[PDB]
Each structure stands twice: as C-alpha cells, then as structure tokens.
Design a protein around this nucleic acid. Structure first.
Ligand SMILES: [Zn+2]
Lengths: 198, 416, 163, 52
RNA sequence: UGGCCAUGGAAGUCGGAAUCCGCUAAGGAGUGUGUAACAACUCACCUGCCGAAUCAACUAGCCCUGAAAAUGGAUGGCGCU
C-alpha cells in the first residue's frame, strides 16, 4: 500500500490530462463531503472533479513526456487547498455552473464577513427562552406572547468585519446562513491559454 | 432446564384451575395428598379402612360413587412402589358437568417442588388450596446452624424443610493448666475456632450462591454462645451472602433438632420478607410520582399502551384487580376488537352494538388480566411484580391507583 | 399542526422499519402517531395488510399520512430483497437454525435489484452497481457454489441494459 | 448561572487533566507519564472523571 | 444501509458470526463519548504554514519506584560526588 496506490494516482492524473485539454482549478476551502457529492451528482455527465496534493506537483512529469509545454504556467497556482475540475465543454459556461451551485454552511466564528449580514424582524420559533443572548450585544427583542420576536431590521456584521462568537451562535439558532461560500475559482487552463476569472 | 420447568409449572397451574371448577355430588370427590417420605402401603391401608367405613353410608348416590373413587385411587397407588420425591397428589371423583355428563376422573401427579403437606378429604368439590398456596410461595430461605459441636446447612420453602449439608468437629478444650502456655493455648484455641467459622462461611458460599448470585431470598443463622455472631459480622463472611442475613436466632439444641426450633422462632420475620420487597418496589414507583420525572404509568388505558409501545421496565399489579380481557365479535362483517373491562362494564354493557353497520356485537368470552400479564410479559418488557394491599404504599396503589401501574424504561408523554 | 389542531393538507411522511407481522412489542404509533390523527391498533392493522404475504423476513415502512389514512409502502433494501428471493418460506417459530442458509444462485435476478435502486450510488452505470449488490449479500454467496470477492471483476453482462 | 466560555476557562484549570493510577497526582491532559517520583513516572494514567 | 444476528433495544457503537463493494482523495459495515434507539460529538487519506531527521517495538547497564518496627546508630568510623 502507498507505493502501488501512489503509482495508480500518477496514472489517474496523467490520463485526465491526456483526455481533457481544459482544466478548472477550484479552491476547496471549508467544504463538506456532502458538498462534494452534490457537486459530483450535478457535474456527472460532462466534468470530472479531482482533489490533489504535491503529486499534482507532477504536471512537470506530464510536460517531460516527449510533448507538452504550457503546463509550466500551472505550477505556481497549485497552492492553498486546491482541487481540479477536468472537462471538455466550455470555459465561461462552466464558471457560471460552478458559481450557481454553491451551499449555505452556517457562520464561522472568528473569520471575515463577505457581505453585510442582517437580522430581519421575525419570531425565533421557541417558547419563553433566553432573550438575554440576543440583547447582550445590541438587538431589540421582545417576548410577544411566548415567541421571541426581533422588533427591527438591523445590520449586525458589515463587510470585512470579524464575526463574534455569541452573534454567530444566535444566527445558527435562527437558521441564518450568509457566511461561507462553497468553492472559489482562482485560475483556469483552456487548451494552453490561462485566464483569471475573466 | 429453566424454560422446561416454567412450562411444567404452567401445566400444573392450568390443571389446578380446571380441578377447582370441577364440582360434584354430596361428598363423592376425593382430595388426597402424600408427602415424599411417606410409605404407600400405609396410605393403601388408610384407603382400605375408609373403604370399609364407606360401606355403611346410608344414602345411595354418594355411597357407590365414594367406594368406586376409593377403589380407583387404591389401584393408582398399586402402580407406584414408593411415594416419589416431591410427594403425590391424588384427585379422584365423579364430576358433574354440562350435557348431564356424570364422568369419572383421576389425576395422580408428583408435583413440581417438594410438598410437605398431607391431606385426606372427601367433599362435593376438590381441594387444591395446598397446591395453589405452594405455587404462590416459591420463596426459599437458607438456614445456617452453627454449634461448637458442629454446623448444619439447610433450606426452607413455605412448606418444605430441607437439609443441604452438615459436619461435626473435634474442637479443643476451654482451659490450659500451665501459666505460660495458658495464653499461647488460648490464642491457639481462638485460631482453631476462627478456622471453623471460615469453613462454615466457605461452605455457605459453596451452597447458597448460584452463578455468583445467591438463590436464597434470605438466610438465617441459628445458634448459641455468640458463634452465629462470630459468623454474621465477620469480614470472612462474603457480603453478597451477609447482606441477606435477616435473623440471628438463639436456639436450644443443635443440628436438625435445633433446625425446626430455628424455623418456629424465625416465622414472623420470614413472612415479612414479601411485605418488605413490596414496600421497596412501590416505594420506588411512588418516588417518580413525588418528583416530576415522568417514568411511570397507571390505569389499563395507559399502562397497557405503555407496554405496547416503548416498553415498561417493571409492571406492578394488584392480585385482586378483577379487570378482564374480552374478545368482541361481529355477526355479519367479521370485524372484531379486544378491550380491558371493569367488573360492571363487563357483566352488562349496551355499548357493544356495532353501530356503524347496525348489528349486535357479541362479546365472546374472556380471560382475566393478572393471568394475561403472566402469559406474555416476557414478550414485552417484563418483571411482572405482583403486590398486595397490606403495606401503606401498597394500600395507596390498590385503593387509589386502581392496583395497576409500572416503572418505565424511559420518560413517556401521554394525552387524552 | 402548528398552533392547536389544523389540517391544511397533511401529506406527512415518517420512516419506520421492520414489520414482518403485527408485532406484540409494536412501538408503531405513539410520539408521532396520535398527534396528527393516526390512531394505533387500526394503523398497525393497515401496516400488517401492506407488509403481509412477502416480506415476512423484515420490511421497511414509509408512512405517508393523508390526514387519517396512512399509505404504507415497501421501499427496497438490498439485503431484504435477497432474503425475499431465498428458499422461502419458513416464516416464524422454527426458523431457529437460523436464517443463513445462503446458497440460492440469483444471477439475472440481481439485475432487477440494481435496476430498482432509486438512482443513488453516484455510479458509472450497472458495471459498478453489480459489484456493490454482489457484495451486499452477507448470506447469499453468489452463483450456484461461488464466492463473492474477486469473481465480480470479470463481469460480461448487463452493461447497457440497466439504464 | 455562569457564562459558558467563562466556565470552560475554569474547567481548563480544574477538570481538563490526567490523573495517575498509582499516586492520584493531578496532571496536564497531554500527559503520558506521571510527574511523581513516588510512583516512578507510572504511565498508568486515567482522565479525571467529568461531573455528570 | 434500520447491513446481518439479536426486538429488550444496537441503523458503526450492551455483546457475537460477519466483514465486502461504490464514490473514491477517502472514511472501519467502525476506536471511543454517549444514547432506550438515534442524533450530536470524537477517533484515516490528503493538503496550507513551518524546515531535517523522525518513530516504533524489544533488550541490557547505572539510577529511581516497588521498600513498614518498635532505646539513638553504624559501607567499621569520620567522611566522600
Ligand atoms: Zn503518580
């Protein structure tokens, strides 16, 4: 194990490179197995998704094989948490399909905020429970007959702001999930030419 | 096997129920019972005199039925050469029944458990009060009997008086007639004496334990000279055995002649054990009602539903409760339903018309629920705990709670 | 169903499993049952009627409540349908030694099993599904007198027929 | 009653510990061996039992 | 995939016969926590950072734990690193 498998992994990546002349480098990021399965089910017919390591630092060996240049441009961009998407359809269409899929995934306590997150005026869906968790920071909440109702549309977290722990937990209890993303596109490979999501 | 024993018990329980219902004429029946030690010839002699005296019964019907009943039992007893262990229970007669069917009947059987009860009777009906009284009191108690001469071990069902094991010992003298050696010999005497307690305690673990969990519901020490007290409170005595020590009896005499003295003294305390186990259980049930908790049930509407569903852990029942399981049936459509009814709701009830269709819904005959609980608690959740109305907690459970409840496996919600 | 007692439509589903016969220990209704208008004994009788004459060796019970009428269905599990297609039927009470005979062939019968799978598996068609259901069998032991393991590798059938 | 993050901070100091099976020494939870020369750095350790 | 035995509940998890395939980058028909039972949590394969050794299982030397006695005390004593 892990000598024959390592050789089998080299055979997987080279065959995918030989089959498809176009690849889409996608950042994995905070991602679930459930997400990856959903993406597999959506992109089943056309594309083939892969997730690699520093044996993707091995496109060099494909470029060595009595043929290819152009794969030399792709070596620096295999950094961070990276996985590939091999495919033959198109480039701008596939970019739109990747952007369109995505997933919610609830608040990460500590990380940055991508958009201006809000709390709409609505009931929590509980009995006479702790209103003190909501009112600790600066939110107007009443016990309007049993249910804890928020009485105003207020912005908690703004763009480029750090998400606190107590406010993250309250958003998770409310089922408000603007944070996270799913997966991001950093760079592209299209028959030799490189693009930067443009 | 344990399962085969339970089937043999149920077989006899069923048989017993059918014999109590029997009924017959004048005093044509016989209820005869023989203990295991007894000789059959002596019994066959007794019946031969009872046959002779019966020859001068004035009334016809009775006389001829009696003599034939006495001849049958005499012939059944010819087949056995000895009275078997567990005794013998002979039930002869000529029972009247439906269809005007005055039929002869004979049931000799060696019962399960040993019986220490003799009985000769004739009557209009059979008398199985001995057998049913046995079947209730399965509770065995142990009897360790210490003496400076030698020990004894035996057990004690409600009826039967057993001997398990006994030994005698060559113990030393009280005194040592030297000044210096007095002390050494006195220590030596006390070490021999302690080794004897150890042996008795070891043999007691040998006898009274079963699968690292003692069979005897209690245990009694019975002696004199603070020798039982040596055993009772010693660290030598295994705590699983020691925790069931209920009485330390003070007896004159020793061994098997002291044994039956120890039983006579220990009677009230050995009767109270069932009453104590009742209190402990219903006390445990009532604590759940005292707190919020919600790991309880009560009423045949609830307690059964709880048993049907996410099952109970313990199913408390009062003997007397009288609530019964009928099976109702339709004439035309062949629809049916079973319900658990009270004494007045079962005797006469205009509820049972089918209504939706418009027919009379005939209530096909019952069986009554204590019996139903016993039939299939094993196929539910189990520990069918029969309790009485004697204890203060039991009295509440019977009078207040309707004599039915349960301690559940977890919390359960109920509505309506 | 939220505030007090209201059916706006009620096509409510919940998943019970196991149901050869009525069952004394039941555990069918409560919790979900009574609140929602489905009863207990009648619901057990309806559950027996659907899961009657096959399967009597364990079944699955999705319960779609239409206000008061439950629609019990048998959604297929792989091992259940293998046990249904065994050497039937010695149902209950001996029995006893035990339910693991496991020499009942099924070569082209498992083709139907891979077809009846509710898509699932993230597969590249039956070629891979054949390998899965040929090993799901804890009991069966594959064809006539074969093993499962590595005979699966050399399949020569039903690649294009199963879609 | 008590603020959760504040609680877990005081747990860290009182309850997130290893315990020596020989000498009952209270040890940091990463511990593989004991501190105590009295029990010869036993290595028979167990976790401190959590309050239910 | 409520896999099978076990219903008293074990859909990975009181126990035991099993014990493979798919997706696979890859996850045991499951190390535990805990559950009536789930859930929820926790325990490979792979990356990002950092920057050369790292780690396991035995084995035997000294040292230490194991190592409790009654007048105050004896490597002979003083002492000795
Ligand atoms: Zn220690």
């Amino acid at each position: 194990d892990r000598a024959t498998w390592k050789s089998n992994y080299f055979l997987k990546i080279i065959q995918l490179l030989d089959d498809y002349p176009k690849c889409f480098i996608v950042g994995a990021d905070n991602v679930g197995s459930k997400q990856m399965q959903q993406i597999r089910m959506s992109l089943r017919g056309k594309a083939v998704v892969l997730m690699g390591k520093n044996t993707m630092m091995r496109k060099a060996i494909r470029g060595h094989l009595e043929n290819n240049p152009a794969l030399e441009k792709l070596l620096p961009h295999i950094r961070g948490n990276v996985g590939f998407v091999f495919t033959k359809e198109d480039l701008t269409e596939i970019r739109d399909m990747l952007l369109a899929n995505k997933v919610p995934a609830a608040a990460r306590a500590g990380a940055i905020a991508p958009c201006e997150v809000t709390v709409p005026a609505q009931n929590t869906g509980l009995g006479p429970e702790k209103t003190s968790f909501f009112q600790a920071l600066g939110i107007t909440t009443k016990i309007s007959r049993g249910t804890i109702e928020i009485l105003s549309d207020v912005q908690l977290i703004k763009t480029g702001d750090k998400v606190g722990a107590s406010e993250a937990t309250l958003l998770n209890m409310l089922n408000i999930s603007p944070f996270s993303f799913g997966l991001i596109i950093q760079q592209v490979f299209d028959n030799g030419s490189i693009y930067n999501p443009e | 096997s344990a399962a085969d024993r339970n089937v043999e018990i149920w077989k006899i329980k069923k048989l017993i129920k059918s014999l109590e219902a029997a009924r017959g004429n004048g005093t044509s029946m016989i209820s005869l019972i023989i203990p295991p030690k007894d000789q059959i010839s002596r019994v066959a002699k007794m019946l031969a005199d009872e046959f002779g005296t019966a020859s001068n019964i004035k009334s016809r019907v009775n006389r001829l039925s009696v003599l034939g009943a006495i001849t049958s039992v005499q012939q059944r007893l010819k087949l056995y050469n000895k009275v078997p262990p567990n005794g013998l229970v002979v039930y002869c007669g000529t029972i009247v029944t439906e269809e005007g069917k005055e039929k002869k009947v004979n049931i000799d059987f060696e019962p399960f458990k040993p019986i220490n009860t003799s009985l000769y009777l004739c009557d209009n009906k059979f008398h199985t009060e001995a057998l049913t009284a046995l079947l209730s009191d399965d509770s065995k108690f142990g009897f360790i009997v210490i003496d400076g001469s030698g020990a004894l071990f035996g057990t004690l069902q409600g009826n039967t008086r057993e001997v398990l094991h006994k030994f005698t010992v060559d113990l030393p003298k009280k005194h040592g007639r030297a000044a210096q050696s007095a002390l050494r010999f006195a220590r030596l005497r006390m070490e021999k004496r302690h080794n004897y307690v150890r042996k008795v305690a070891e043999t007691a673990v040998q006898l009274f334990i079963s699968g690292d969990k003692v069979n005897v519901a209690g245990l009694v020490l019975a002696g004199s000279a603070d020798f039982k007290t040596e055993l009772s409170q010693s660290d030598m005595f295994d705590q699983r055995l020691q925790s069931k020590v209920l009485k330390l009896v003070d007896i004159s005499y020793g061994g098997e002649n002291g044994f039956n003295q120890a039983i006579e003294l220990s009677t009230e305390v050995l009767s109270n054990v069932k009453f104590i186990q009742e209190k402990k259980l219903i006390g445990r049930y009532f604590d759940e009602i005292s707190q919020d908790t919600g790991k309880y049930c009560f009423g045949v509407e609830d307690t059964l539903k709880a048993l049907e569903m996410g099952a109970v852990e313990i199913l408390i029942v009062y003997e007397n409760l009288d609530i019964m399981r009928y099976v109702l049936h339709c004439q035309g459509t062949e629809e049916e339903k079973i319900l658990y009814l009270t004494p007045e709701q079962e005797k006469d009830k205009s509820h049972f018309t089918d209504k939706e269709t418009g027919q009379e819904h005939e209530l096909i005959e019952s069986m009554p629920l204590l019996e139903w609980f016993a039939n299939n608690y094993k196929k539910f959740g189990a520990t069918l705990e029969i309790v009485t109305d004697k204890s203060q907690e039991g009295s509440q459970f019977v009078k207040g709670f309707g004599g039915i409840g349960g301690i559940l496996r977890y919390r359960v919600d109920f509505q309506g | 169903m939220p505030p007090k007692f209201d059916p706006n439509e009620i096509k409510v589903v919940y998943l019970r499993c196991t149901g050869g016969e009525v069952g004394a220990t039941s555990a069918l209704a409560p919790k979900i049952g009574p609140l929602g208008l489905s009863p207990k004994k009648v619901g057990d009788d309806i559950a027996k009627a659907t899961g009657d004459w096959k399967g009597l060796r364990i079944t699955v019970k999705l319960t779609i409540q239409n206000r008061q009428a439950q629609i019990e269905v048998v959604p297929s599990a792989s091992a259940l349908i293998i046990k249904a297609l065994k050497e039937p039927p010695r149902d209950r009470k001996k029995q006893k030694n035990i339910k693991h005979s496991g020499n009942i062939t099924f070569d082209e019968i498992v083709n139907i099993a891979r077809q009846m799978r509710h898509r699932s598996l993230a597969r590249e068609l039956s070629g891979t599904i054949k390998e899965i259901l040929g090993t799901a069998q804890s009991v069966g032991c594959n064809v006539d007198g074969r093993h499962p393991h590595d005979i699966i590798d050399d399949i020569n059938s039903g690649a294009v027929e199963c879609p | 009653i008590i603020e959760p993050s504040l609680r877990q901070l005081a747990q860290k100091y009182n309850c997130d510990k290893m315990i020596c099976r020989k000498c009952y020494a209270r040890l940091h939870p990463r511990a593989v061996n004991c501190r105590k020369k009295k029990c010869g750095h036993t290595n028979n350790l167990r976790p401190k039992k959590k309050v239910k």
